Structures are given as C-alpha cells and as structure tokens.
C-alpha cells in the first residue's frame, strides 16, 4: 500500500463535500440536545492523550468509533508493539477551524503510540483503508480523519 504525502487528502475534494464527510450541522456542547449523539470509546488498544483531563478526546459518533476501532487493529498488525493514538476527538476548547467536524465528534487527530513521524503517511493510508470518509495528512505531527454524519430521519 502507498502512504499519503504531506498535505494530501483522500478523497481529493473538500472535507464537507458530499463525496467526503458532508456538511456541518452545528457545534455539540456538553450540556446540549445533541450531546447524546456522542459515545465514549474505551478501546484498550487505543491510546488517548486526554491532556484536557476531561475525557473529551474519547467522545465521538458511532461511525467514528467503528472506523477508529478498525484502524486500531490495522495499526497493531502493521507495526508490532505499536498502537493507534488519538490526540484530539470531540473538542470543547474551540481549538479548531470555526466549523470543525471535531465539534460534532466526527473527526479525530491521530498518531502512532511511538510518535515516529516516519510512520504517519502509512498511518493515513491505513485510515483510508479502515474506511474513514476523509483523511488529511494535516501536520507533520498528526493525521486528521473524519466521518459522515448519520442520515436525517
Ligand atoms: Ca486532546
Ligand atoms: Ca481538545
Ligand atoms: Zn483534526
């Protein structure tokens, strides 16, 4: 398989387009009507940084959890002794773009547990094969992956 290049995104369209992760609905806050859309991920095969000490990095939508758990398995098989690591999941800090999918729990920023940057291009490729709807080699320090929202009723 072929790693992504720095700043490459797949599919090669903007994140919030139909063919990628789709439109932003709105920010989910902790005491909001939509907080129930988020579920915590307690997978022992994923390392969550949780530098906030709030557990926010673990909260995500069901589709996000499904793709992330699949990626966790492929990371361990690619590099024995290494695990998937999440540095950002749902965000309440306002530390992303104004309509970031992190605010809806539909995006994660990821690394490997060893923080070996030489692996990140391949990590991004694994995220694509794990089925994330948009994958962006955003920083030398992390990959940004997002998923579609569930369909309206
Ligand atoms: Ca974090
Ligand atoms: Ca955060
Ligand atoms: Zn991100």
Swiss-Prot record:
Changing residue 79 to R: Causes a failure of Shh processing leading to retention of the immature glycosylated protein within the endoplasmic reticulum of transfected cells; causes a temperature-dependent conformational change that allows Shh to bind Ptch1 at 4 or 32 degrees Celsius but not at 37 degrees Celsius; drastically reduces signaling potency in chicken embryo neural plate explant assays. It is a lipid-anchor. Changing residue 150 to Q: Does not affect signaling activity in any of Shh signaling assays and causes no apparent defects in cholesterol-mediated autoprocessing reactions. Multimer. Ca(2+) 2 binds at residues 52, 88, 91, 93. Ca(2+) 1 binds at residues 51-52, 57, 87-88. The chain holds residues 40 to 192 of 437 of the full protein. N-palmitoylation by HHAT of ShhN is required for sonic hedgehog protein N-product multimerization and full activity. It is a prerequisite for the membrane-proximal positioning and the subsequent shedding of this N-terminal peptide. Binds calcium and zinc ions; this stabilizes the protein fold and is essential for protein-protein interactions mediated by this domain. Zn(2+) binds at residues 102, 109, 144. This is Sonic hedgehog protein N-product. It comes from Mus musculus. The dually lipidated sonic hedgehog protein N-product (ShhNp) is a morphogen which is essential for a variety of patterning events during development. Induces ventral cell fate in the neural tube and somites. Involved in the patterning of the anterior-posterior axis of the developing limb bud. Essential for axon guidance. Binds to the patched (PTCH1) receptor, which functions in association with smoothened (SMO), to activate the transcription of target genes. In the absence of SHH, PTCH1 represses the constitutive signaling activity of SMO. It is found in: Cell membrane. It comes from the Eukaryota.
């Amino acid at each position: 398989l072929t790693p992504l290049a720095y700043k490459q995104f797949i599919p090669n369209v903007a994140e919030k387009t139909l063919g990628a992760s789709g439109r932003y609905e709105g920010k989910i806050t902790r005491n909001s009507e939509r907080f129930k859309e988020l579920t915590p991920n307690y997978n022992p095969d994923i390392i969550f940084k949780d530098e906030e000490n709030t557990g926010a990095d673990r909260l995500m939508t069901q589709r996000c959890k499904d793709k992330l758990n699949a990626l966790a398995i492929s990371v361990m098989n690619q590099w024995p002794g290494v695990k998937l690591r999440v540095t950002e999941g749902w965000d309440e800090d306002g530390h992303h773009s104004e309509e970031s999918l992190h605010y809806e729990g539909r995006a994660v920023d990821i690394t490997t547990s060893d923080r070996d940057r030489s692996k990140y291009g391949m990590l991004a490729r694994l995220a694509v094969e794990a089925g994330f709807d948009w994958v962006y080699y955003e920083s030398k320090a992390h990959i940004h992956c997002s998923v579609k929202a569930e369909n309206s009723v």
